[PDB]
Ligand binder design. Sequence first.
Ligand SMILES: Nc1ncnc2c1ncn2[C@@H]1O[C@H](COP(=O)(O)OP(=O)(O)OP(O)(O)=S)[C@@H](O)[C@H]1O
Ligand SMILES: Nc1ncnc2c1ncn2[C@@H]1O[C@H](COP(=O)(O)OP(=O)(O)OP(O)(O)=S)[C@@H](O)[C@H]1O
Ligand SMILES: [Mg+2]
Ligand SMILES: [Mg+2]
Lengths: 442, 442
Amino acid sequence: KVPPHSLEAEQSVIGGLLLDNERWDTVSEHVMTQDFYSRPHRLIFDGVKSILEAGKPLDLITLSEYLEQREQLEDVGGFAYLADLAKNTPSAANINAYAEIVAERALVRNLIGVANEIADAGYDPQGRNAEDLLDLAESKVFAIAEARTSENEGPKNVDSILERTLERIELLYKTPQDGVTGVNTGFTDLNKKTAGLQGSDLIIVAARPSMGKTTFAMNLCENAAMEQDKPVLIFSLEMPAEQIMMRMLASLSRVDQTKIRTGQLDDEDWARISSTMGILMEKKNMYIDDSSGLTPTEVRSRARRIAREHGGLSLIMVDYLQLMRVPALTDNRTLEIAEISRSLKALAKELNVPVVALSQLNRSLEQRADKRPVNSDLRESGSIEQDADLIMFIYRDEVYHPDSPLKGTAEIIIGKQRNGPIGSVRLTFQGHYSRFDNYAGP
Amino acid sequence: KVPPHSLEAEQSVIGGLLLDNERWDTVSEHVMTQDFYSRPHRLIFDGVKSILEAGKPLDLITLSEYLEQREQLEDVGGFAYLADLAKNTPSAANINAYAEIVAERALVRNLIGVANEIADAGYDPQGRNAEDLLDLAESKVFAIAEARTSENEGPKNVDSILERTLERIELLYKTPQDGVTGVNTGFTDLNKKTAGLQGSDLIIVAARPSMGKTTFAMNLCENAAMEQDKPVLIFSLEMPAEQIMMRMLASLSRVDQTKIRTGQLDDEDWARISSTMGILMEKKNMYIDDSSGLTPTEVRSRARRIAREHGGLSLIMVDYLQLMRVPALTDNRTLEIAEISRSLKALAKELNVPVVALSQLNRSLEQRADKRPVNSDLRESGSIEQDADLIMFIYRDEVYHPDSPLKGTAEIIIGKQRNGPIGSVRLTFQGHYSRFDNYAGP
DNA sequence: TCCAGATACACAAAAAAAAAAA
Ligand SMILES: Nc1ncnc2c1ncn2[C@@H]1O[C@H](COP(=O)(O)OP(=O)(O)OP(O)(O)=S)[C@@H](O)[C@H]1O
Ligand SMILES: Nc1ncnc2c1ncn2[C@@H]1O[C@H](COP(=O)(O)OP(=O)(O)OP(O)(O)=S)[C@@H](O)[C@H]1O
Ligand SMILES: [Mg+2]
Ligand SMILES: [Mg+2]
């Protein structure tokens, strides 16, 4: 059988070395003298490496002269073969890939050789017992695997990591940026715990029906759009853009939502609406997608298109993740939810922007004495919680207990945070404006 | 009869990608792997997609070594075909102009394949009737259309949404309608707290057996048909049309239902019935369907036919949504109910008409000291409570406590309203006339 | 693999009773 090898890869490596000299540093750290297969190729590579290490400039003429000095010019095919190799070079940009291919082929060939060597033993014990045969397998495989080393995926001593951490904390002494390092939510208490909405993270807001989930997410997105510079993308798979716009106008302009919807407004309400209209038309930092049944690929494509068009994004909202469709798994729901969650996390990591994805809760919450949500109430949510960087629930006590002393107030439960504290935050809820607010009072 | 294809477009796309890899972002959004016709081109495009999706450089050597690793370089024609493909492409100036050609050719080929398949199925009925063949053809054509119905959809900015919202608000403001902008329900407090039954919404009425769901729904439908000009469509999956007609006659004529059903009637009752018949024949805005076991597609088709024949509809009634069935999801009841609710919501959104979906309640209510229904008591109802826009419960206290001070009275609880307040409304219930009415006392 | 409906045993226990404390 033909051993695995790529002569074209070796020719490309030689051509790239001849044509380009500034990239020798990267090539020198990936290939050796014994990695090449063809003997004339080995001689040519040895000569080129010797010339390059000698410090002399590399060119076809000097390479031919050096080969003639050792009388190996005719052995490697002559000057014509070298000229053909130089002419057949595709480009010098991808010499690293060629070197990696050559190294991989050498590794697999040596592994096959070691396998044949161990296989030969056993057909001729030569006095060795089973224990000796077992022992002289691990040593050979470890020898053939030790040549490759992870870079830099290796254990590190405390000195380097401690020095890097000291450097990090020394530069962070200046410019505190008032605590928040990501996207300002607008609520001081939640800013203290979450330290803003960090990028490359997945944030999940979940609650029972009619709790204030879409309102909370829209408030966060509106504050981000008002403060930040890059646009904020919203995927409204539940409601049309008209209703979201009416809610935003009611929230910003301090105008009753019902009067806006029914068209019963006085002069002051119109003045407030005109002011917020002027502000919104001056900003131009909001995008709404009202399409239904979007697949993860479509969401990714549209997000990438917007990001490339405007150079970046600030925040992405999905409402909600259970309404997305994966046609390849229409016969299974749990796997579909897992794929949706993994795709959302991958998109968040790729675009380096936070993604606020909403979710629903199971009906087991209301069949218990205590109605406070937990992490198990999310529907089909092994993956929903496994790959979530922050889970925030919404709980209003006045819904279940009409006589509760916490009327006109809501609690945000941080059920999970990888690098932050957890707890509860109390916020004032004003439904007629579709707005949350800081708790000025007790 | 050669199926449509264009090898030149595929070769141009592959050559443009090989020459410059920086335009893969635009190309990946237009042409996929399966759009190609020739199998070697499909394999080479799979290899190109695999190489470029990870960001690694793509060239002749990389693609050739990737194809050779899986014994697939012989099928595509070897390195010679790849070299010819790379050489034959002058430049990638209009690379985006060939992906559309490939996509449209693939779409035409799929359409003609489906057209041949339907004819072949028609030539071999295999025991299927013509109705089944027509249904299959319609389903396949709809599935084809849904994939590429339009391309103008996408993330829109805030300017167009603001302009449309301002136009709608001004239109509503300039035409006062006594505070109700939707279909009047006939009850003053309910209209005040609901502003009518707004269009493009899903409304659910739920109560325990023998509480008044059908009576309340029929009262709403009668009032809507009496005031509106467009007709009202009623789906009666439970009771025959004769019983509903008798109940409606009793409600409108103010005549005992038992006397009408049995036949012992006086002269004043006959006079009132004659007046009601005259009014009904004068208006004639009612359509009653009494078929059982209807799939969502059948009700959608009937509603479309009625709306097309009469140029619009004002109200659609389903009683009740647990009687509808999807034959493809018989093995799971929860998914079937979710599909029914989703289909009802989609129909309401499409036709721009309020839809009343009567629902039952679970038996977990009877185990509580408080018999007032909650949103979680609906049967098999994740989507029922997560998709509705207005939930109205019916609760009569005299059924549980015979000597209540609220005898001859009923309470309606608005358990959920996405864009409105929640509360309760007290109404007078007259069983012998099978109708609700306004309440004047405290 | 989750969601939803329903019969039955067991945990006390929960309050209420209530005895009785006052
Ligand atoms: N004018 C108003 N006055 C008082 N409460 C209101 C008013 N308008 C809306 N609300 C309430 O505000 C809340 C809004 O709920 P949302 O957060 O928008 O919906 P949701 O939480 O996403 O739940 P879904 O999507 O319907 S399952 C509801 O509880 C409404 O009853
Ligand atoms: N002549 C009458 N006198 C007194 N009560 C009456 C009379 N006729 C009807 N009723 C009551 O009015 C109710 C009518 O409500 P219905 O519409 O039958 O309830 P329902 O929701 O349809 O029950 P379902 O369909 O089985 S879930 C009856 O169940 C009786 O309780
Ligand atoms: Mg919502
Ligand atoms: Mg009924």
